Assembly symmetry: D2
Homo-oligomer: 727 residues x 4
């Protein structure tokens, strides 16, 4: 060997580069100077490779790693080949059970800092000073599919954050919608079995579009609120960077005085909210099933660090019963019009892992991992989650020492009398393994609860009632939140919701199930019920037309913070544009394009009908990132076609389809000079249309107009015209 | 609170102290300055305790570790109690499967050094320089019993040594007898199932005295040689310090020129060879089932470091076929009169572990863990062993990363393309996980074999023959090695062997099995078979009386290295003497006794009818180690009774029995002044008797005579007189 | 070949015999006519052996079970020997973790029957009718020692009964003294760590006679009551047949009208109460460490069925 | 052994032979079969050596490997014929 090319092009540069410019790499090679306390303490288990000899695991150097030991060179393999056996054995035991739910996910390292001290409301140490930085490890995920399933499915997304604080690990384990599907953890296996692949044949993967899900939903109207979010474009985010996160349950903040405040946790995406459209999402599960995982990783390698603002909705203990819903009911959201989100800090994700399995796959988060200054509530869904994550981690990660797996280790001290268990790493020197003891002078010792650095003491909440298996009558209301959700959506968001339900219910084979779901929609909103019914060829009865809509939520008839798009929050930095090249590109158009993209932090992908390079009109050699078919429009946010020799691609089927697909999917399109010939493939008026940028050259205002469209994400006014396009 | 006594007597002194003087403790607290390269590298996972707060595994401080969280102080325990749940969950999962064989064992840290370079015969780096120190971890064990079974059972002993070399771990996994019971690995489960507790009722523990063992033995005469070692006093060693160790198999040494030399490995105990007698051993399993584990640990805390000399039996490739037996047959020993053991180096065990479970229980040794400079042979029992150990470790230690458990880790570099698996600690940064690769320039890389630091390449032995399941005809001889062993024993050794078989066969319920074993003994030696038959009320037939004895082994009719005692090798340092106190001890006797014992490194334990203290004749306050019943004569090597007020213990039942038990078990006894009144208890002549030290006071020659008896270990001439003794 | 002696003296007679008269044997060979519903349902998974060929686990008959496959009779073992590999692999994976506590234990099958209907105080179906028999499986044990430790140590004894009822399994998991050492489950690991072998050297086995235990007891006076039982001759029973058993906790009986009655469960030994003396017990741990296991099995083989009220 | 939790994966219903299987292997995680054989080893006299070995033969015989001739040195080497 000397396999590497002599020019060094096998190794990516250790500096921020745009998506697709270099091969991606382990975080610690790609960005060796990005550090935080967690990332520095993982340094003891990191292994290098360059300049080392290949060995067995026992440190024996290997001479020939190409062959098994045999009796004669065409003979039988011998049992004494301990090198083969160790290598095959390790390979044979590589896999561990995937997570029962949220098996599919993507993770990154980062840090958090508060905006100011929150000691008036919580004694939680990570929130006590704006200069105190807490390292974090975040894992984003889907819910239903296996570890090998696709990213852009329609589903809820998980959003889990491990805070490595100085007084313990705090895991904030949330999703991307503000409520869950069910109220009591006793029904979690029933709900999850219903949405997962059906048990006789294990179909379908990553989809709720099947009979058992809609059967369960039709029989359990508590589910309807999260089902509404899942059927909206919230179920198909553009990126884990452009979705919100929520803890869902009401928890408690506890201050040094012992006062409890009810809280609901929020993550606000600083890149803004943005989702795909169903056809694009579903096709993308086939063109690039790793699309979210890839775009997260590459955004970090490019310096487009995912940033989220931590927000709290705070409710005084005395206001527990002032809403028309139960605050402990996880199928109910707290409208931001009633209880605003107070901004409290920012988290930045600025480094990828080194080994996906070691750090992402083995990561273990628990909602029960809280610290002094925080506490639980009686939310019956949250209460059952406190049992389940520790239990599931004993078999997923092989034993009770999963806190010793490097990614999961606290960065603060931990000492106790727990001993042994499978794969015990820590070697205890304590003469005692029990307390109280005199032989080690009772160390390690308990610590009284206090303002800081004190022991954990539960908030002394009053408990009164009988031992009962019973749902609180306050939780038996199921249509007002789904209604408030529906009425807060724009007209196109409502349409997407109708089309989500219609598509999904079309795949339910038993027709009575679709009719039972349509009946439930009629108790939410009649316009929604009717439009779904019409796509299913179902007719509402007399009685269904007279169902009285549920009441407003505390007087609210809408809450624009529930919409993805009603209030503009577009950010173009980190988005990507496809540029369709020709064999003689007008280089003046390219410079103007590339310069304007660069100024907003927008990336470009130069596409052509083959790989290699093409030469512009001034001799600039342009390297091609991908072909038209290899990097479809689904993977980009907008498409620009510069002038040059358009005859080269004017009859290219793939080139024409690229624009028809982008057009169908409502993406901004910009055509310079003779690129305007492509207006006939997308049947666009001679005079132009909103959403289509066109001019003689890709000049001054042409780029500003494209970038304005991109900031608004998609061209929703084109919806009525895409119906006709065969694409 | 306040638990430690204010005088600090809860903590043992950090310096060498005699057995029983202080509470024993973790190695790193007891002897913090004893270091070696492996002990230093374990420092990264060692945990402290003093001055730390008590936490959960996630680093959250605990305020109340005495109570569960409940609804009211007499209410039901709440599911939200995460502190209770982690603590009980870790406890609930403490246990891991015990080793299938050798589950019971005791271990210690130490170091090895060769006497001179062995470069001429092996390129093994640990043996290339007398100044090169190799850290070791050694585990001694029994074979049959579980991890909770007793130490002083009659069984074979394991003696496994892990060498942390600069070119890889080398495990030398041997036993305390030079042969094994069976020839081919395929019968290992059969042999082990036969010796282990019987399957219907799981009895008996720690014993071969039962029908299935002797049934297998009587049908598989290959077992007879190791059975003779086990029935001898070799099966009941006095200590892991006073037994020999052997690799058993013939292995190969490979030098830099590629020459192979056959080698059999040996460990010589520098404390000498010494065993118990059956009655003592059996009773000791009940009075102190942890006797060997305790004795080892305390010898190391006292500075009596177990020391062993590594020795090689070397045989040139050309002499492979020159013996009467096959060198690859593991039921055959290589007589030291034909092939002397050449001294190679010294191993010293000088520090105990910190945590038995983490370092002892999880330690994993494999005979397949060899390094360049060593190689295997076709011994068919060893060949099968190469498969078994890695296999068993995937379940016992939970996955294929058992090399990352701290005690098992190489101290030299290890790098390769193995990834994942349960409990993966190492975080790999190599962009490649395969070779050949270009993206990491093919690192880590293969290394050609060579004189030092080269890759492992198997010795190119010629193989020729058909694929067969067939025992070599050269292995078909079963009685000459058993006969050589027998004839090399002293007369009292022979009697102990007769009694071992007689005792064991008396526990076999089916009489025909005892008859068939007796018939096999008659093919070894008629004197042995007749004496066993007579103890079993069996009469040999006329053809059994005419079976021709097997031939001598290469002309030898005996080899004194096979006896424990024929060639004196006694060493008193680290032995212990019981001193039976009275309530007015003559202090002049005690000073003479204790100073003489101290000069030879012999320990003492001051015994009485109660605990606390007694006052000598001159006011000296004497602290009592144990009562007569609490520390029986079984635990000591000799007994001394000083003068004083003998009428205080003259009629104590326990005091008298102490002497009868030590007298029956052939230990030296010394009686000073009026203590000679006890001569009537042990019916000893007025004139005295060899083995009994007696005088007017414990003064000049008294102690030298007692120490001479101790140097010879036991008073074998007393055997004919102990048969009368009711004790 | 091989055989069994021609006189058939290798096989125990299938009828009640006294301790030591014959080799002991699996129950369904020793007492083929003893049945109950549980014992009969286990017949689907019972395996015989006589008259069957030796095979791999995949049903392939084995021709030579004495040798590995090698290249020449003195050659190296070949990787293709799948018979050897399955055989050693099964053997290598025999062991499972022992119980964290109560690892040392001896068990037997049997049956339970109430004297009269308890329908006035409980709706439990196994106690509703004096002619309704409930199969049981009982496991008796020590607490501290491993599964290979000794039987006649000084310790508490566990007495666990599995009732196979018509409305579900009821497990009555008790001990041989009416109280436990500690009050709250949160201290269990603390107490058990203190009585168990000390963590630096893993000594001593099957004994509370050591510093950590007595340190814990001296700092936690709530332990004293069970300590008193443990130090009496209740800590060294003569047999599992001659000790009491107790559920320890207060549980509840619920009748068909919904009334709750507090209840504490007891087992009375119909063989009477009897214990060893310390010296005898401690010596017996060395002369016969399987004494309670052996004497229970042999009592059942002899027709001296352990009976408890 | 790790995918299916132990050495008794032949007892999982789908994997079970439909023909007889008897041998001296015992124990292992999740052991379903309850063995009544007084012996768990061979050779044994206590169960008259059952279950027993069967010689190879034309039908219903024990497995015996074909006696191919092996000749060469112990090498880690690719056959030149494969290149
Ligand atoms: C508000 C409702 C819930 C939310 C927001 C939620 C969120 C999550 C997230 C984000 C993950 C993946 C964490 C990771 O990335 O590793 C997860 C995993 C999991 N969840 Fe929850 N969950 C909810 C309800 C429940 C309930 C009610 C249960 C059972 C009672 C449950 C059991 C589990 C389990 C067993 C896992 C796998 C954990 C592992 O293997 O480490 N979840 N959940
Ligand atoms: C000369 C013959 C043998 C010797 C000297 C020997 C020695 C030993 C020793 C000393 C140990 C315990 C290591 C420790 O303290 O952890 C051990 C364990 C073991 N032996 Fe061997 N043994 C022999 C034959 C065999 C054979 C033929 C097999 C199976 C083919 C076998 C399978 C095992 C297994 C499975 C373990 C447990 C290992 C673990 O769990 O790490 N042994 N043996
Ligand atoms: C009155 C108090 C208790 C009694 C009478 C009792 C009794 C027993 C008995 C008889 C067994 C062995 C069952 C068998 O033969 O398989 C056992 C096992 C066990 N006990 Fe308890 N115990 C008590 C308290 C506790 C507590 C407080 C805990 C933990 C909170 C606990 C945890 C365990 C565990 C983990 C096992 C092993 C079970 C298994 O592996 O199947 N015990 N106990």
């Amino acid at each position: 060997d000397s396999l590497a090319p002599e020019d060094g092009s096998h190794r990516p540069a250790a500096e921020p580069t745009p998506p697709g410019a270099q091969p991606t790499a382990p975080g610690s090679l790609k960005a060796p100077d990005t550090r935080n306390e967690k990332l520095n303490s993982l340094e003891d288990v990191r292994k290098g490779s360059e300049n080392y000899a290949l060995t067995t695991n026992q440190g024996v150097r290997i001479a020939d790693d190409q062959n098994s030991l045999r009796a004669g060179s065409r003979g039988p393999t011998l049992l004494e080949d301990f090198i083969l056996r160790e290598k095959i054995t390790h390979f044979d035991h590589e896999r561990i059970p995937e997570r029962i739910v949220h098996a599919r996910g993507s993770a990154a390292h980062g840090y958090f800092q508060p905006y100011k001290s929150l000691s008036d409301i919580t004694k939680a140490d990570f929130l006590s000073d704006p200069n105190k930085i807490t390292p974090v490890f975040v894992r984003f995920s889907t819910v239903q599919g296996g570890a090998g399933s696709a990213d852009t499915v329609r589903d809820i997304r998980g959003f889990a954050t491990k805070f490595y604080t100085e007084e313990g690990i705090f895991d904030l384990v949330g999703n991307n919608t503000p409520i869950f599907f069910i109220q009591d953890a006793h029904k979690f296996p029933d709900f999850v079995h219903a949405v997962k692949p059906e048990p006789h044949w294990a179909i379908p993967q990553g989809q709720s579009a099947h009979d058992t899900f809609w059967d369960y939903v039709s029989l359990q109207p508590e589910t309807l609120h999260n089902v509404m979010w899942a059927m909206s474009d919230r179920g198909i985010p553009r990126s884990y960077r452009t979705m919100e996160g929520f803890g869902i349950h009401t928890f408690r903040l506890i201050n040094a005085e012992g006062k409890a405040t009810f809280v609901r946790f929020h993550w606000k995406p600083l890149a803004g909210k943005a989702s795909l459209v169903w056809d694009e999402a579903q096709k993308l599960t086939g063109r690039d099933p790793d699309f979210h995982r890839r775009e997260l990783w590459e955004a970090i390698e490019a310096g487009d660090f995912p940033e989220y603002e931590l927000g709290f909705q705070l409710i005084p203990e005395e206001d527990e019963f002032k809403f028309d819903f139960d605050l402990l009911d996880p199928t109910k959201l707290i409208p931001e019009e009633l209880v605003p989100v107070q901004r409290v800090g920012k988290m930045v994700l600025n480094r990828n892992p080194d080994n996906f399995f070691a750090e992402n796959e083995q990561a273990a988060f628990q909602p029960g991992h809280i610290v002094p200054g925080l506490d639980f509530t009686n939310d019956p869904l949250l209460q059952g989650r406190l049992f389940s994550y520790t239990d599931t981690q004993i078999s997923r990660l092989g034993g009770p020492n999963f806190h010793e797996i490097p990614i999961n280790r606290p960065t603060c001290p931990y000492h106790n009398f727990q001993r042994d268990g499978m794969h015990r790493m820590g070697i205890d020197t304590n003469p005692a393994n029990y307390e109280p003891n005199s032989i080690n002078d009772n160390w390690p010792r308990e610590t009284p609860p206090g303002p800081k650095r004190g022991g954990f003491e539960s908030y002394q909440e009053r408990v009164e009632g009988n031992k009962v298996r019973e749902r609180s009558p306050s939780f038996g209301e199921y249509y007002s939140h789904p209604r408030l959700f529906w009425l807060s959506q724009t007209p196109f968001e409502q349409r997407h919701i109708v089309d989500g339900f219609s598509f999904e219910l079309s795949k339910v084979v038993r027709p009575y199930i679709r009719e039972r779901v349509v009946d439930q929609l009629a108790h939410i909103d009649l316009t929604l019920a009717q439009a779904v019914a019409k796509n299913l060829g179902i007719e509402l009865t007399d009685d269904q037309l007279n169902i009285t809509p549920p009441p407003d939520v505390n007087g609210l008839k809408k809450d624009p913070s529930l919409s993805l798009y009603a209030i503009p929050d577009g950010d173009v930095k980190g988005r990507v544009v496809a540029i369709l090249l020709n064999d003689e590109v007008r280089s003046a158009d390219l410079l103007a394009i590339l310069k304007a993209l660069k100024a907003k932090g927008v990336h470009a992908k130069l596409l052509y009908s083959r790989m290699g390079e093409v030469t512009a009109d001034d001799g600039t050699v342009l390297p091609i990132a991908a072909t038209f078919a290899g990097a479809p429009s689904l993977t980009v946010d907008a498409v620009i076609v510069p002038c040059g020799n358009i005859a080269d691609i004017a009859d290219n089927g793939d080139a024409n389809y690229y624009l028809m697909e982008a057009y169908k999917h409502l993406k901004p399109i910009a055509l310079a000079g003779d690129a305007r010939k492509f207006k006939a493939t997308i049947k666009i008026a001679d005079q132009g249309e909103e959403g289509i940028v066109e001019a003689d050259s890709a000049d001054g205002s042409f780029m500003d107009e494209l970038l304005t469209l991109m900031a608004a994400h998609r061209v929703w006014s084109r919806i009525p015209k895409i119906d006709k396009i065969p694409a």
